[PDB]
Nucleic acid binder design. Structure first.
Ligand SMILES: Nc1ncnc2c1ncn2[C@H]1CC[C@@H](COP(=O)(O)OP(=O)(O)OP(=O)(O)O)O1
Ligand SMILES: [Mg+2]
Length: 528
DNA sequence: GACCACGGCGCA
DNA sequence: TGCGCCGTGGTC
């Protein structure tokens, strides 16, 4: 079985990395498998040149590493993408192998043979699933290539800016900590939620709103604290200390230490097989959760900058998931708001900012928000919130109808579907415990929405990418409903016009897709 | 050194 | 609703 390297063309590849992150990994071993043969390469890096496409489990990763090494080696078939389309709970090679007749090993050879067999079985199970087959060829498989090029490109970080910002923020943090300690009458580890809990609820006269989920301690979460705002001057200082040490410990300090030596840029991983709805995730580091909603957060966004001679182009679908819902439900009054190009969190507010009472709820229909989350996060009475939630479902009848429609059907089939037929199996829809059944219901009806928006965005990236190469531009990040591009300073405005139209027309619905676009020297300014 | 559970929170 | 990462407390 053991044939000499190189392997027959179009064989399944296995490979061992020294660590998960392709951009930081040493390629320990490389092998291939085809026609019941196993070809282990004598020297991994050398053998990498002999490939025309990575084909096998985790193809994108190997391709990202090749790309890092100058080799233009594109990802192709991946048994992982197939498994993920069958059941999005297939997020792992350990899980997938086990499930479809293999064993995820630490040997490149056994991994290559695992890639061959696994693909055989998985691809057979997709014979009969034409909509899932359409997604795999037209969206997923091509997408993996686009993602390999985003991961290899990276985004430029303003290191010295973050260094200086760390020093400023550390001083403020010290001031908040000293204030908190004076109000507490004694020092303690303010990072420790346990010690904090004793201080607030025991030593002080503070009431305890709620409990934590797994161990039932008195919660010191932000929600609980915002309620205790007026109850004591220490609370306010703790809210500020929380925000500052969150942003410092998670972004300001770690990010500068991840610049790659060769490239001088920051490289995330876009996980294509991670979420239950069809969305991408990002890790090592996560760049889909860089701060923005706060002033300190926005100072962190500025750190992300264009290469010298380039600009960033930030494109951003407006009310993406809402528009998807209008199309999925077929609700008249809702479509005739987007078609009239009318403000959504204002024209929905007309059925003062009795208008964020339109936004925070528009968001809270997708998630299945309860009258509570609404009132207690809207700073108004409880039944003032309930009235709002019923006034909304009066204006938009077919929404309620689509939600119930989707749940009934998901009970019978055991799964739900995006506009394109991406599935998520939801088993507890017939659980006999109300809280479990109803939790199942909320992820069941949210999935078609969220996952359809993700399908549209994925398809938009697959269509946009080739147009960018032609124009000398590059795609840097995706944040669920936003894209960040990088273009030569001279063609920025042409690229912005173009990317915008590609995204708006990705797949026409019963409602228009409006995209906002900004250009700037940094991520903050590129969003107008 | 690695890893785990938890509470907590950054973003969409 | 969907993620990934932080420090703390803790095990191995
Ligand atoms: N506070 C929140 N809670 C839950 N989901 C949220 C959220 N904020 C955003 N999302 C999710 C849901 C959709 C998306 C929200 O993006 P935009 O904040 O930009 O809201 P948009 O609909 O575009 O209206 P615009 O604000 O521009 O007036 O991320
Ligand atoms: Mg927006």
């Amino acid at each position: 079985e053991e044939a000499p390297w190189p392997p027959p063309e179009g064989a399944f590849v296995g490979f061992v990395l020294s660590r998960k992150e392709p951009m930081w990994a040493d390629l320990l071993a490389l092998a291939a498998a085809r026609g019941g043969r196993v070809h282990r390469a004598p020297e991994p890096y050398k053998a990498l040149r002999d490939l025309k496409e990575a084909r096998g489990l985790l193809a994108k990763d190997l391709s990202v590493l090749a790309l890092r090494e100058g080799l233009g080696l594109p990802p192709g078939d991946d048994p992982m993408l197939l498994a993920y389309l069958l059941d999005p709970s297939n997020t792992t090679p350990e899980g997938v192998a086990r499930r479809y007749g293999g064993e995820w090993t630490e040997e490149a050879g056994e991994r290559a043979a695992l890639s061959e067999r696994l693909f055989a079985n998985l691809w057979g199970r997709l014979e009969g699933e034409e909509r899932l087959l359409w997604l795999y060829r037209e969206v997923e498989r091509p997408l993996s290539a686009v993602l390999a090029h985003m991961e290899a490109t990276g985004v430029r970080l303003d290191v010295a800016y973050l260094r200086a910002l760390s020093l400023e923020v550390a001083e403020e943090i010290a001031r908040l900590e000293a204030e908190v300690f004076r109000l507490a009458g004694h020092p303690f580890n303010l990072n420790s939620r346990d010690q904090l809990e004793r201080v607030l609820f025991d030593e002080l006269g503070l009431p305890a709103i709620g409990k934590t989920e797994k161990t039932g301690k008195r919660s010191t979460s932000a929600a609980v604290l915002e309620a205790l705002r007026e109850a004591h001057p220490i609370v306010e200082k703790i809210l500020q200390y929380r925000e500052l040490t969150k942003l410092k410990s998670t972004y300001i300090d770690p990010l500068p230490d991840l610049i790659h030596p060769r490239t001088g840029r920051l490289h995330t991983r876009f996980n294509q097989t991670a979420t239950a709805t069809g969305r991408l995730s990002s890790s090592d580091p996560n760049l889909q959760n860089i701060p923005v909603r706060t002033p300190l957060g926005q100072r962190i966004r500025r750190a992300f900058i264009a290469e010298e001679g380039w600009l960033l182009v930030a494109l951003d679908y407006s009310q993406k998931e809402l528009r998807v819902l209008a199309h999925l439900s077929g609700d008249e009054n809702l479509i005739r708001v987007f078609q009239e190009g009318r403000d959504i969190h204002t024209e929905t507010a007309s059925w003062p900012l009795m208008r964020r009472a339109a936004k925070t709820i528009n968001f809270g229909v997708l998630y299945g928000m309860s009258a509570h989350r609404l009132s207690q996060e809207l700073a108004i009475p409880y039944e003032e919130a309930q009235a709002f939630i019923e006034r909304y479902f009066q204006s938009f009848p077919k929404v309620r109808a689509w939600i119930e429609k989707t749940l009934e059907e998901g009970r019978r089939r055991g799964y739900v579907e995006t506009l394109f037929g991406r599935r998520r199996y939801v088993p507890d829809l017939e659980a006999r415990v109300k809280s479990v059944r109803e939790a199942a219901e909320r992820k069941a009806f949210n999935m078609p929405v969220q996952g359809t928006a993700a399908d549209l965005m994925k398809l938009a990236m697959v269509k946009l990418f080739p147009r960018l190469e032609e124009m000398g531009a590059r795609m840097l990040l995706q944040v669920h409903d936003e894209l960040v591009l990088e273009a030569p300073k001279e063609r920025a405005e042409a690229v912005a016009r173009l990317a915008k139209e590609v995204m708006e027309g990705v797949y026409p619905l019963a409602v228009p897709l409006e995209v906002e676009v900004g250009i700037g020297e940094d991520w903050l300014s590129a969003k107008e």
